[PDB]
Amino acid sequence: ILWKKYVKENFEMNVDECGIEQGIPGLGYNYEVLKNAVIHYVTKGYGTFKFNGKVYNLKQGDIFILLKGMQVEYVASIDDPWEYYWIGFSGSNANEYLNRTSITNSCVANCEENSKIPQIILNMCEISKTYNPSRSDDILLLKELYSLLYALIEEFPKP
Amino acid sequence: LWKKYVKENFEMNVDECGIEQGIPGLGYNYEVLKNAVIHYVTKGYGTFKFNGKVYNLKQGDIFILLKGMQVEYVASIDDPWEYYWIGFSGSNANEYLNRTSITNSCVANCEENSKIPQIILNMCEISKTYNPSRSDDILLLKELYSLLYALIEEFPKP
Ligand SMILES: OC[C@H]1O[C@@H](O[C@H]2[C@H](O)[C@@H](O)[C@H](O)O[C@@H]2CO)[C@H](O)[C@@H](O)[C@H]1O
Ligand SMILES: OC[C@H]1O[C@@H](O[C@H]2[C@H](O)[C@@H](O)[C@H](O)O[C@@H]2CO)[C@H](O)[C@@H](O)[C@H]1O
Numbered sequence: 354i355l356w357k358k359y360v361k362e363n364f365e366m367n368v369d370e371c372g373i374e375q376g377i378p379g380l381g382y383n384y385e386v387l388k389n390a391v392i393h394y395v396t397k398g399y400g401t402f403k404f405n406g407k408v409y410n411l412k413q414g415d416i417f418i419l420l421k422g423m424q425v426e427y428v429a430s431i432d433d434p435w436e437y438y439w440i441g442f443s444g445s446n447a448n449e450y451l452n453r454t455s456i457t458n459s460c461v462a463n464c465e466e467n468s469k470i471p472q473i474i475l476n477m478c479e480i481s482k483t484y485n486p487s488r489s490d491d492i493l494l495l496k497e498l499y500s501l502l503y504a505l506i507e508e509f510p511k512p
Numbered sequence: 513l514w515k516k517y518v519k520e521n522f523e524m525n526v527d528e529c530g531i532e533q534g535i536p537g538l539g540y541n542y543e544v545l546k547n548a549v550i551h552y553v554t555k556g557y558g559t560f561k562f563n564g565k566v567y568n569l570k571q572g573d574i575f576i577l578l579k580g581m582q583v584e585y586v587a588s589i590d591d592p593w594e595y596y597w598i599g600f601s602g603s604n605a606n607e608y609l610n611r612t613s614i615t616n617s618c619v620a621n622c623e624e625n626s627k628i629p630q631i632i633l634n635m636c637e638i639s640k641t642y643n644p645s646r647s648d649d650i651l652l653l654k655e656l657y658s659l660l661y662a663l664i665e666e667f668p669k670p
Contacts, residue, residue, distance in 0.1 A: 363604070364523070365523045365524070366524075366653075446521070446653075450647070450650060453647060489611060489661060489664050489665075492608060492657055492660060492664070493661060495524075495604075496657035496661060499650055499654035499657060502650060503647060503650045503651060506647050506650070
């Protein structure tokens with residue numbers, strides 16, 4: 354329904370792509386990640402995420418993150434296929450900030466009831482649907498990416 | 513408050529945040545060396561002089577200093593201004609400044625429902641207890657993107 358790809362115009366902090374996908378029962382993806390980092394938020398239904406010999410059964414409110422070099426498989430459930438929203442991002446600041454959160458350890462997490470993460474990801478995907486750089490949507494998306502990385506660090510801090 | 517930060521970023525950078533209560537009849541007369549410095553007048557009165565114009569500024573006014581400007585700004589004798597300032601730099605910062613009309617005269621008034629005052633005050637508050645181990649660096653960049661967005665929204669080019 355949405356897969357907006359942006360230019361790699363920034364090297365410190367960059368929004369690479371925003372997407373929304375309703376899974377087809379029993380179908381998904383099996384590949385080595387090429388993109389820098391892609392955070393997925395499960396909005397509905399059920400799917401599986403497999404990485405490094407572990408198989409996670411994910412549901413509404415779960416996050417999984419893809420990082421360059423990871424061999425992953427993620428597949429919608431046969432009975433009740435997931436919908437997910439994703440933010441792909443890159444840059445030297447982005448990668449330093451990712452090292453301040455525990456989520457990059459296992460690459461899976463659950464959003465707490467009062468999490469700020471869902472609203473930010475949904476808002477970035479909404480902006481991306483009618484992206485207009487002449488209306489400074491580029492500034493708004495970078496503001497939201499900084500808010501997202503701040504929220505990940507606040508909710509999933511390193512020891 | 514006068515917190516100076518490293519020039520650690522080149523696309524978008526918070527250079528400094530400050531708060532100054534002016535001394536009656538005193539101020540500054542110099543060629544600006546910093547990239548860009550937005551000042552917000554929180555109290556009182558002062559004068560800003562640039563390119564042969566003399567502005568009488570008051571609470572709610574903004575003035576912006578840009579590299580190369582020869583400026584004089586002086587607190588009023590009767591009720592000296594307090595001002596808050598955000599110094600910033602970077603290739604993104606300078607592109608975004610070209611999307612606003614405020615860089616034409618370098619003076620403006622914040623309208624009643626403006627988001628600018630709350631952002632500038634919040635950045636100066638964060639800067640007072642700046643702790644990078646608690647990711648205050650990310651928070652200040654988030655607020656700088658919010659500030660430049662607000663300037664474009666409230667002071668658009670025609
Ligand atoms: O990037 C999130 C996005 O990934 C898609 O999978 C793509 C991937 O983006 C691409 O770099 C790789 O070369 O091929 C994959 C397709 O096998 C997913 O299709 C999409 O649902 C999102 O998860
Ligand atoms: O940068 C805003 C800040 O400027 C101070 O003035 C300094 C200026 O920053 C510095 O670049 C220059 O070399 O010396 C000036 C003092 O003469 C102001 O003092 C301060 O109130 C702010 O306006």
